[PDB]
Design a protein around this ligand. Structure first.
Ligand SMILES: [Zn+2]
Ligand SMILES: [Zn+2]
Lengths: 165, 165
């Protein structure tokens, strides 16, 4: 019953235009699933809340997904290692998504996301196009109440530590 | 019944001299458990096989643990991103442990270990003293037959790809 998946990267290059509600498919890419499309779908399943705790976040596809969730009324909170001050984090911040951050020293090295306080997405993968398309990486997607509890506790500790006020 | 733990880092600094069978405790460090001691114990529980697939590996404590397992007759196979050509990987290689490697370009970005084809240890953590003592990181320790199967399959694919012959 409970979701337990693992995605291995590098991801196959596939079309995500419909998934990401592209404005305006006739493209040449495969229209089938990949590790990236599976990750996107896990995130886009969010109806209530998304916590993101990511060392690095520059993927425009993943940025678009998070944008759409914010536009849908999902409560999005993001922690990254760098403040990123046309970056994705810059665009998320401009859209009104709360982003808190570390010293850009390497210290905040988690790569996880929590969807609706019920699904934990966690791996070796930094959310960058370079890593997604080129690196050997893993991302776990788990509906596990204890892991979600413990990761949400960690998230909230880091969230409060980085409160700009 | 099945093990499902998560270790969060940075690790408390605690004594590991007895655990790592130090030659020759009167030290000033706490003699209690930490995220690092828990990781060490998970590895040292190996009786048969250890597969390590690690972006970076420079921790002398973790190096010592792997050494001891090799000396105990455990079948140790290591994949790292860099060839490391007094490094830990150098010392493991000299001791007769088979190490295979990537291009030192960032591509081999996993941070996992498989103990006795039954426990998967996987996280955000690179096995370096700097990361262990300073970074916010997670390491999962899971007795999960499907995750172990799929991670062992991935390991073997990478192992064969990097066969020096
Ligand atoms: Zn298309
Ligand atoms: Zn001691």
């Amino acid at each position: 019953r409970p979701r337990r998946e693992v995605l291995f990267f590098p991801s196959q290059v596939t079309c995500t235009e419909a998934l990401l509600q592209a404005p305006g498919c006739p493209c040449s890419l495969p229209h089938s699933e990949s590790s990236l499309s599976r990750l996107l779908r896990a995130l886009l399943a969010a109806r209530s809340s998304l916590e993101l705790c990511l060392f690095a976040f520059s993927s425009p596809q993943l940025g678009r997904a998070v944008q759409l969730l914010h536009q849908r009324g999902v409560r999005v909170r993001v922690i990254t290692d760098c403040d990123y001050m046309g970056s994705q984090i810059g665009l998320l911040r401009k859209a009104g998504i709360q982003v808190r951050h570390d010293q850009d020293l390497g210290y905040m090295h988690h790569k996880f996301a929590i969807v609706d306080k019920k699904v934990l997405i966690t791996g070796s993968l930094n959310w960058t196009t370079q890593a997604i398309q080129n690196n050997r990486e893993n991302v776990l997607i788990m509906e596990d109440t204890e892991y979600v509890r413990l990761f949400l506790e960690e998230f909230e500790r880091i969230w409060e530590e980085f409160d700009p006020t």
